[PDB]
Amino acid sequence: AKLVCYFTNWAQYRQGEARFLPKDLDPSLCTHLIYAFAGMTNHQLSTTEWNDETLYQEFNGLKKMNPKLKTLLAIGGWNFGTQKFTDMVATANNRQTFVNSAIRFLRKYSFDGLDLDWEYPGSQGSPAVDKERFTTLVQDLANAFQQEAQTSGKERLLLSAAVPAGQTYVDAGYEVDKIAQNLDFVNLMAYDFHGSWEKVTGHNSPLYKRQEESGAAASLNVDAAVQQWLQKGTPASKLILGMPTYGRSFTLASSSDTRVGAPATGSGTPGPFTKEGGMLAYYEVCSWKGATKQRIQDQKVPYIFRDNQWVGFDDVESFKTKVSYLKQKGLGGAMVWALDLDDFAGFSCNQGRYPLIQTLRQELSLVPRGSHHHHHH
Ligand SMILES: CC(C)CN(CCc1ccc(Br)cc1)C1CCN(c2nnc(N)[nH]2)CC1
Numbered sequence: 001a002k003l004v005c006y007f008t009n010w011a012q013y014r015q016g017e018a019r020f021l022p023k024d025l026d027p028s029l030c031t032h033l034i035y036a037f038a039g040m041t042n043h044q045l046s047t048t049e050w051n052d053e054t055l056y057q058e059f060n061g062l063k064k065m066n067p068k069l070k071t072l073l074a075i076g077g078w079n080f081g082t083q084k085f086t087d088m089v090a091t092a093n094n095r096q097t098f099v100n101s102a103i104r105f106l107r108k109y110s111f112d113g114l115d116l117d118w119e120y121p122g123s124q125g126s127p128a129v130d131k132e133r134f135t136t137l138v139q140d141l142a143n144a145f146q147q148e149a150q151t152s153g154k155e156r157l158l159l160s161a162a163v164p165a166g167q168t169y170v171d172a173g174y175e176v177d178k179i180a181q182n183l184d185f186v187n188l189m190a191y192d193f194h195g196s197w198e199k200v201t202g203h204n205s206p207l208y209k210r211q212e213e214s215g216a217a218a219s220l221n222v223d224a225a226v227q228q229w230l231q232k233g234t235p236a237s238k239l240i241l242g243m244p245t246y247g248r249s250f251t252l253a254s255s256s257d258t259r260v261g262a263p264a265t266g267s268g269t270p271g272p273f274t275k276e277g278g279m280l281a282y283y284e285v286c287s288w289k290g291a292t293k294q295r296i297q298d299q300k301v302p303y304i305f306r307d308n309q310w311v312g313f314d315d316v317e318s319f320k321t322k323v324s325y326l327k328q329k330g331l332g333g334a335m336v337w338a339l340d341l342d343d344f345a346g347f348s349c350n351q352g353r354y355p356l357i358q359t360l361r362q363e364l365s366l367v368p369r370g371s372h373h374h375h376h377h
Pocket residue numbers: 006077078117162163187189192242246247274276279280281335337341
């Protein structure tokens with residue numbers, strides 16, 4: 001099994017106990033650590049934060065403590081846009097420029113692979129031709145990584161991609177059966193299914209549909225997303241199930257209607273550390289005073305409300321349920337967004353350090369046998 005965990009290079013700017021740096025990383029928590037995010041300049045892989053080079057050394061230095069650990073660098077993300085990807089994949093010359101830059105960059109900074117996080121080929125302004133061009137890019141990278149391993153004698157660079165759960169995005173951008181052959185693993189973004197952009201409450205990451213749902217809405221859940229990627233040609237062993245250590249919040253139209261599907265007027269109040277209306281870290285919801293926690297029985301996940309605020313999130317129990325699910329489906333493991341959103345320092349939830357991600361590791365049977373300081377949940 002794999003446990004693929006994302007580090008984010010902006011968590012270093014959060015205040016107080018929420019500030020996260022590579023020092024807060026546990027070298028033996030995950031099997032693969034992915035650094036979010038790199039960018040692109042003139043079709044070449046590039047840093048995005050002023051101190052990325054410092055952080056890369058600390059991040060990849062974790063492998064000194066755990067030589068088994070693999071690291072990857074993720075390019076893109078949700079603020080990156082699409083134009084730079086579109087321009088880079090548009091010609092063979094630009095793709096070659098990118099691919100060669102990626103090999104040099106990853107080797108220079110001691111990463112073991114590249115994770116593609118384009119949001120998304122064929123959507124969000126990206127033209128329809130980017131669907132096939134993304135396939136070509138994936139093939140170009142896979143082939144070049146294979147060739148570099150041959151010529152250099154080094155362990156082949158890994159290639160993964162973070163892929164959407166929603167059918168509209170999948171069909172607009174992803175030749176699933178083709179790309180799955182060339183990717184080492186597929187990081188399924190099984191979250192952001194619902195959120196404050198919608199006019200009624202809904203859970204960030206429900207495992208199954210609600211009985212009431214119909215039409216396209218009935219596929220906005222983890223099980224449908226997993227089945228979608230499997231049926232479209234992803235080998236189960238390559239499919240890695242995303243798990244969110246965050247929730248999505250709503251302001252309710254009325255404090256008297258707190259159901260799933262209740263009317264909402266907009267995003268929930270921003271969290272005190274993450275400061276982004278509509279989202280909350282696990283550590284911002286786990287210890288909410290004077291709130292009422294509920295479970296969505298059909299969907300196997302919790303929500304919590306207080307006054308006119310409503311948040312759908314994941315807890316230890318839902319992570320256990322989702323790992324049981326992924327094992328039943330024979331998936332390759334779990335992926336987690338993100339290290340810095342779990343209670344990484346144990347400052348909030350009274351569950352020790354990394355309670356959610358340790359739950360994943362435990363349920364995947366990935367606890368190191370020589371481990372001393374872990375915490376079972
Ligand atoms: C703007 C928002 C809808 C993006 N979404 C949630 C990110 C996020 C989570 C928690 C908080 Br607090 C603030 C922002 C991302 C989740 C992670 N995801 C992702 N990218 N790559 C992987 N493997 N997962 C990209 C979207």
